[PDB]
Amino acid sequence: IYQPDENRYHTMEYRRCGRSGVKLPAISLGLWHNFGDTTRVENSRALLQRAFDLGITHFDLANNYGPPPGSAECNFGRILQEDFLPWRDELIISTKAGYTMWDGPYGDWGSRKYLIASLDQSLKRMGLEYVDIFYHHRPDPETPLKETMKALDHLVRHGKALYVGISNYPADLARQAIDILEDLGTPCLIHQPKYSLFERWVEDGLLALLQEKGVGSIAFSPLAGGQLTDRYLNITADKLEKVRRLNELAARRGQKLSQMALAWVLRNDNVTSVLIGASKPSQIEDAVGMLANRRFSAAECAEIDAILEGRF
Amino acid sequence: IYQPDENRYHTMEYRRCGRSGVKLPAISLGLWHNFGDTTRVENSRALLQRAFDLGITHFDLANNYGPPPGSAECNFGRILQEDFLPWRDELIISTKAGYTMWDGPYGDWGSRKYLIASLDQSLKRMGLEYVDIFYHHRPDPETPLKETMKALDHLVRHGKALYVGISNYPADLARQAIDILEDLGTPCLIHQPKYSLFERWVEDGLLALLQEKGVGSIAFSPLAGGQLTDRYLNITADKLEKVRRLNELAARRGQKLSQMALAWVLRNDNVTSVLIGASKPSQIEDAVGMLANRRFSAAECAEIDAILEGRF
Amino acid sequence: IYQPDENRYHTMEYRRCGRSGVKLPAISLGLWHNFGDTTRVENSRALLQRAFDLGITHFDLANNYGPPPGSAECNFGRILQEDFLPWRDELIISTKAGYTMWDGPYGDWGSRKYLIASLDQSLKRMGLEYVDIFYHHRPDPETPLKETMKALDHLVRHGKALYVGISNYPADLARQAIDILEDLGTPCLIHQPKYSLFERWVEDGLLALLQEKGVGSIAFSPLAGGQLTDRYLNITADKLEKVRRLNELAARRGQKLSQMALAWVLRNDNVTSVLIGASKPSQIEDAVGMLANRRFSAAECAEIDAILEGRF
Amino acid sequence: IYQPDENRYHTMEYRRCGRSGVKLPAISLGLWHNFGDTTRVENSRALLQRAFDLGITHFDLANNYGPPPGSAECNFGRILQEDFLPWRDELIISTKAGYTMWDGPYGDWGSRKYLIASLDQSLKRMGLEYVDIFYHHRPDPETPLKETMKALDHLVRHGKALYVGISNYPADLARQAIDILEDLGTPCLIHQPKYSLFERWVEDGLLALLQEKGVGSIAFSPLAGGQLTDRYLNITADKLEKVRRLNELAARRGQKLSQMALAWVLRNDNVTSVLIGASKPSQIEDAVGMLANRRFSAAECAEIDAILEGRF
Amino acid sequence: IYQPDENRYHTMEYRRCGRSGVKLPAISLGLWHNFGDTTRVENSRALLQRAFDLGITHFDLANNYGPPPGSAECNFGRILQEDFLPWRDELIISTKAGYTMWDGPYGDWGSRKYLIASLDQSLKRMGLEYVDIFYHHRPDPETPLKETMKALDHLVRHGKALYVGISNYPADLARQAIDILEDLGTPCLIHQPKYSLFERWVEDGLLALLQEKGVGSIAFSPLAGGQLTDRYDKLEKVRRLNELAARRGQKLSQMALAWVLRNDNVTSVLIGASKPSQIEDAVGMLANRRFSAAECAEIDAILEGR
Amino acid sequence: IYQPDENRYHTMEYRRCGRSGVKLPAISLGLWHNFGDTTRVENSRALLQRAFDLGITHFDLANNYGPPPGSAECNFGRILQEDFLPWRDELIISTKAGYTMWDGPYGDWGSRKYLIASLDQSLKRMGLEYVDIFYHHRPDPETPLKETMKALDHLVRHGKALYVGISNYPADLARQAIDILEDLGTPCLIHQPKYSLFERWVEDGLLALLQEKGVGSIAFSPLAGGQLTDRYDKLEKVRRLNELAARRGQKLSQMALAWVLRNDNVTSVLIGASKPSQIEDAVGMLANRRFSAAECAEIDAILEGR
Numbered sequence A, B, C, D: 001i002y003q004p005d006e007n008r009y010h011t012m013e014y015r016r017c018g019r020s021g022v023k024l025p026a027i028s029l030g031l032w033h034n035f036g037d038t039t040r041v042e043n044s045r046a047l048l049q050r051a052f053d054l055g056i057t058h059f060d061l062a063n064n065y066g067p068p069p070g071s072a073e074c075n076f077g078r079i080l081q082e083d084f085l086p087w088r089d090e091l092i093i094s095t096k097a098g099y100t101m102w103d104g105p106y107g108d109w110g111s112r113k114y115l116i117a118s119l120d121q122s123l124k125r126m127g128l129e130y131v132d133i134f135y136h137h138r139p140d141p142e143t144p145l146k147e148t149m150k151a152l153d154h155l156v157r158h159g160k161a162l163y164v165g166i167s168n169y170p171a172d173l174a175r176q177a178i179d180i181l182e183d184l185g186t187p188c189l190i191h192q193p194k195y196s197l198f199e200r201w202v203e204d205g206l207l208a209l210l211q212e213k214g215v216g217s218i219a220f221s222p223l224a225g226g227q228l229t230d231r232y233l234n235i236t237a238d239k240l241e242k243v244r245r246l247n248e249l250a251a252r253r254g255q256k257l258s259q260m261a262l263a264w265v266l267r268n269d270n271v272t273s274v275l276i277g278a279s280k281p282s283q284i285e286d287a288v289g290m291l292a293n294r295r296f297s298a299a300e301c302a303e304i305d306a307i308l309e310g311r312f
Numbered sequence E, F: 001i002y003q004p005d006e007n008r009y010h011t012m013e014y015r016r017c018g019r020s021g022v023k024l025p026a027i028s029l030g031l032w033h034n035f036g037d038t039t040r041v042e043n044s045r046a047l048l049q050r051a052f053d054l055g056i057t058h059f060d061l062a063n064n065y066g067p068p069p070g071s072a073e074c075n076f077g078r079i080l081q082e083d084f085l086p087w088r089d090e091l092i093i094s095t096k097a098g099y100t101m102w103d104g105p106y107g108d109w110g111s112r113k114y115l116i117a118s119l120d121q122s123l124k125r126m127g128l129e130y131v132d133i134f135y136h137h138r139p140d141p142e143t144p145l146k147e148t149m150k151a152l153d154h155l156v157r158h159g160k161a162l163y164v165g166i167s168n169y170p171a172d173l174a175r176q177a178i179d180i181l182e183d184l185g186t187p188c189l190i191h192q193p194k195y196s197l198f199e200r201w202v203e204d205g206l207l208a209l210l211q212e213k214g215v216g217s218i219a220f221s222p223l224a225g226g227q228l229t230d231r232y233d234k235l236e237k238v239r240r241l242n243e244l245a246a247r248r249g250q251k252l253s254q255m256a257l258a259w260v261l262r263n264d265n266v267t268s269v270l271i272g273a274s275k276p277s278q279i280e281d282a283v284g285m286l287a288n289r290r291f292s293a294a295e296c297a298e299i300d301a302i303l304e305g306r
């Protein structure tokens, strides 16, 4: 019988998601990889237990995570029932619809049919009465935004999601989505964009829009899929040189490169949380350990920018 | 155990229903005839299986289809449970209320009482939690349109229908119905009118209204009840001459007359789908085969119009 | 096993309730008396069966009908389950809250607490998922009208009543109630006032207001509690003289006095239905027999008015 | 088997809560103390039975009452099932969320997550389908007021609370909360502030705001936690002198000091009810006995004010 | 959230109940007193948690335990749901019917109506699908033993009790009851008699009968209602016994519990407790369970007043 | 969506289990290894689908199979719901209790409490209303055999198991168990013993007893834990046996499975597998099941070291 570490809320920093009542853990765990039927459930279980023990209260899923599609939700559902049920109200659990889940015209994209039918499937797979956050997973250019937004509003009003969010929406469209949801009376809680030292698109307008609108943000691929780790220490030659120079700065800060890379995403206090992936419990411990040194000075930021813009 | 043809989504074209997230199959199957207790369930089952195998994802019912009334919904309900349940989220299932279903003042027309009580009966007969589209089946001149429209809005808000539509509404009234639904916040998805080479009323204003308003359309009786088929090849004498001349043009196009007649309804890309009836699986294969030649040139359209306006 | 008379919809006239989709039987049956534990269920059963056999599709209850309070709903609930369940969708069943039902501050009047808790009790006693019409039974001068009206709106939105109405509301207050309900989006279907040859208050403004607003009406005590019957043939002396003179006019019309008295309430086509009480099946047959002569000429109306204004 | 005293509605005065349909007992019983696992259930049961027998129809709980947290709701739940279920519709039961209930970021404060998850827990512990009043227990300065207010509106619309209220809100913020709720369409029923002879903050603006807005009020700690009782008769020396002088005035009125202190809170007819705590049935009898002399003259009010402002 | 001590099975002794598959802890906890609505649930909860943490896997209830009647079952039911549900299959939970529970002729004694209706009420109060052991709580001298025994047989066959027992049955009647249940196909698992240094009647035939028949035994009031403790003519015996306990390095209560289990003749002792320390004291008896012939002779001498 | 091979019943042999109505596939699949949380569900799913596609209709589980204990039942439960539910009435699913499953005196061995509580847990993990066969997994030398057998009888009468069996029971004890179950009215369907070319103890009396009593048999570890495969003094025997298999046109594993079923004396062989090819190899043994007296004499010679 699993018993959550009694010190878990001392080990983690919780950050308010935009202008809302929700505080997310600075580090959240994504189930994008390592929770399907091609990996071992013993390991999946160990990752979730380690995460909650360290104070990670947010687990992010999607209908099609696995492989195969739906298996991450099923495995999470089993582990939730077996180990976490007494603490479900201490967790923020998300899922999504918007990429390809099942074959045919109703198993992908942004229709009301797909969003409603898919959340019903997700709730069944996970064994939940509701999710905390339901996302539209990517934009659908060919479906009216109001249909998709009204499906999100309907799912909140009917108690299948407490809050809703959007993912992979460029700034212009995000603005439209946010304003529609506000008008419907179910405000967008959060935006999930890709953001790391190596992918800074959100700094071109998205982050400022979200701050304007009171919407939170949770960065995915914050380690640039593993590039911002020890992987290439012990990609292009220019990339490798950048990774070595960033790693030296991380060492100077008493951090692994991955730790500095996670800390850096929260450096301006305009991103709420970082969503990590993990295949082994030590990667979760390392991520949470980033909190020992979150601060970046102006000098450190300039040093990093010069490394990133460096050609030699 | 029925297993849907793995190539089904390669065999069919899916068309967006107005401005919405719903794509209907170019060919939909109606259960108006051949699904009641006066025909054989073995045949009914074969028709539904053949249809889905060819990519037809939309099955259109109504409360009073049979005979007797309600039997098409019951037979569909049984076949759905036995053969299609794992694929229910790949299907668009519709039903309707508005013609005579049961005796007395609450079993016909457009009252809130009849629409709500009838959809509850339909959901029970079909064994469904909700239908994808619920229609008001014909106008009710003596009930305020707002009562009927609010009943549709209520059924969507309370999760018994994902979308709503109207059938047999002339253009002026359709405009009023659409605008009311828009104001209530549950937009009309679709209009179901009668339309074929021999019944072109919708070209007098309805089709343009629906395009203006972003509402889709699904044509019923597209073969003019069997007249636009091989039936009279191997009605009036003038009709017969038209059928022979249209059949010659269809042969020139590598098509049966029925195939050309279905293709013709979608020729201007201002109708979403054609709703066919069938008594045998070969009629479903023939209908889907129309997709091999959907295109009509200006010259072909003029040739057809001249045949239709011909007196000798 | 009871089987409803196959000719029932030939025997009755159905009248549209204001501007709505609901047609009520010209004669409705009230369960105000003869359905409690102080009378015999065999008789109660016979009355309901006779009524439906003659085409009476509307049965009107209230929480406190009996005696004791709640017993009419229980007896109706049993008879409905035993005899009428297959035909529930052919019936309009109403109940009400607003007079004294249980002791204490929450068992009377017009609070949201009382209306919601009382309809839940009524639905349990009757064994129903919803009533067709739920009424506020009388005004509550000390509770804000908007609280009571919002409770009615909430019960419709949440599917416990298909429609709502008000009873015993004077015209000024009825106007306020109607306008509030319209603004909330759940329009008042019907008003239930006392109206007979001997109680004509509604002709002082109420009937014109209801016609203005598209609201129907159902008259209770249309026989002035039994005075407009054979009771005093085979009260004051002036009353008795009026009853004899009205009875002579009824005989001239081929009617019993009670038949003419019911017909008279519908004479101007500004009242929807008359709500009768009955202790024996013959009184229901007599009431429905009034339909053989509903018409009143200007001359007959003047003759009646002169009798009513007569002092000698 | 407990049977409620047949004279209970003769023994108590019921007072309208602001402009609403709800009349609260002049004396309500709070379960803040003496209903957890550190006291005896026999005593808890005796207190609730005595209270209802005397006409106290309102029992006020909160998620974290005990100790331990949740135990008062559980003990109340058991006693309700065992003894009070036939009379649940004669009771007003409240609960709250807003102080610390469970560990972590979702178990305290004012988020939609916490309010919804906590009311679901409360309904389970108490064995109820809904509470009569659900409160936000204290302000949350860091969560947008609209999120918290919309959670209250959502819980009413979805039938988990009949009415909502706020507690411990200063006047400025109370005004904002009230106006938001009005705009959402679920008006604030009641405000629960601390108020007694020794804590008169509400007279600085709150009571006038509530009267302006039609919102009721229920005073907690009306005996200043036991100071306004016999406790110090048979704190500071200045306090003690005040208690002796107030006690002499109470004796002159034929009252215990606690009785006068409760009566005084309702003296201006601008507070709805007083919420008492009790550890033994005699304290409930004493409280209800205050009703024998509720009236205060201008002279008595000046005498009390002079005692309160007295330094010697 | 309570978590059972991981070492709970490392020290406690488990003893097979007659010839059966059931091993009871040498010390079992009874809920006869201190589990009703007149004592604080915080304490009741602490007693159950301390007991299971020390390896006590058997909790003994009855319909009328409280006070008021039924409250011990309700309080236990709540604590079970809240704290113990994941470990229910590690517990042996008993209840009983046979004393006064409700008013009137069907709420006491030995009829099939009372036993069946009572176990249904107990299962509801405790929130259980079945009890591990259901007992007839005392003999009824006027209802045929076959009716009562058939009610026990019916309850096991219908899955409301895994096993049945009898309590307070004198030896001759116990023999009859045991033989009837064996014939019906639901053998008697266990007998619950009063037994202690001061109440040795079971040594006059009951214990030998149970051995003969393969039926287990669980002694109630093993400390003679608290007389065999630090709490105090019998006072002279208590003093003398306490001096022998002292020489054995034990509390008198510890020696008194050890004495009941001196032979494999008794399966378990059912203690009462109002405080966790009393449970800790009882489990500590395990450290010195042996008695020499000299010690037994000395005990008898003290008991017979020599 | 998985669709069972339409030819699945065209090649597999089915063998009647003693004197009963049950015919087991000649090759059955056990879930002892490679179905827990330490191996990938994708592979487990592929093994079950390949097995049923080849006509293997019997899947054998136990409460503690995994690791961890219970996970094989959970994973099987999930795959059953997802892929096999329409064909559940074409499957024989077994489970067992009798080894260590949970901590404490009620989570192992032979008591009625453990067997009943354990089958309830297994039915929940697997999402089944009943198993086809429930086994006592090993003998318990201290719980009366009647108690254990009556728990089996009770579970069948109450519809949680269609049939019962015993596993790992030596012949003399199996005789007693079989006779007790016959008397109770729920006859023993099947015995599951270890048997292979290297473990022939069942030929010393067990097989004859089962024939006499009409009870079937399903051999476990038929490849002696993988020794009778391509994986390798016994190594000299493995080499010599493999040369005989080669002359027969078979893999050693194939000849080893065929040998266990050489006589109608054994109903089925329960194989383990980590890859689908191992299942395919086992089913291929059906192509050469016969042994001449010369071949048997040659095998014995090899076995006895001549």
Ligand SMILES: C[As](C)(=O)[O-]
Pocket (backbone or CB within 6 Å): A032, A062, A137, A167, A168, A220, A221
């Ligand atoms: C991190 As993604 C590919 O699920 O938006």
Ligand SMILES: C[As](C)(=O)[O-]
Pocket (backbone or CB within 6 Å): B032, B062, B137, B167, B168, B220, B221
């Ligand atoms: C095709 As029709 C008569 O159901 O509108």
Ligand SMILES: C[As](C)(=O)[O-]
Pocket (backbone or CB within 6 Å): C032, C062, C137, C167, C168, C220, C221
């Ligand atoms: C006819 As009445 C007294 O129920 O309004």
Ligand SMILES: C[As](C)(=O)[O-]
Pocket (backbone or CB within 6 Å): D032, D062, D137, D167, D168, D220, D221
């Ligand atoms: C009386 As309070 C501390 O629950 O607001």
Ligand SMILES: C[As](C)(=O)[O-]
Pocket (backbone or CB within 6 Å): E032, E062, E137, E167, E168, E220, E221
């Ligand atoms: C210990 As007793 C009096 O309940 O048998």
Ligand SMILES: C[As](C)(=O)[O-]
Pocket (backbone or CB within 6 Å): F032, F062, F137, F167, F168, F220, F221
């Ligand atoms: C194959 As076995 C050790 O589970 O009997």
Ligand SMILES: [Cl-]
Pocket (backbone or CB within 6 Å): A153, A154, A157, B157
């Ligand atoms: Cl909605």
Ligand SMILES: [Cl-]
Pocket (backbone or CB within 6 Å): A220, A221, A222, A223, A224, A225, A226, A276, A277
């Ligand atoms: Cl990453």
Ligand SMILES: [Cl-]
Pocket (backbone or CB within 6 Å): B153, B154, B157, C157
């Ligand atoms: Cl609605």
Ligand SMILES: [Cl-]
Pocket (backbone or CB within 6 Å): B220, B221, B222, B223, B224, B225, B226, B276, B277
């Ligand atoms: Cl057609």
Ligand SMILES: [Cl-]
Pocket (backbone or CB within 6 Å): C153, C154, C157, D157
């Ligand atoms: Cl509402």
Ligand SMILES: [Cl-]
Pocket (backbone or CB within 6 Å): C220, C221, C222, C223, C224, C225, C226, C276, C277
């Ligand atoms: Cl009348």
Ligand SMILES: [Cl-]
Pocket (backbone or CB within 6 Å): A157, D153, D154, D157
């Ligand atoms: Cl809402």
Ligand SMILES: [Cl-]
Pocket (backbone or CB within 6 Å): D220, D221, D222, D223, D224, D225, D226, D276, D277
């Ligand atoms: Cl106080």
Ligand SMILES: [Cl-]
Pocket (backbone or CB within 6 Å): E153, E154, E157
């Ligand atoms: Cl029986």
Ligand SMILES: [Cl-]
Pocket (backbone or CB within 6 Å): E220, E221, E222, E223, E224, E225, E226, E271, E272
């Ligand atoms: Cl004792």
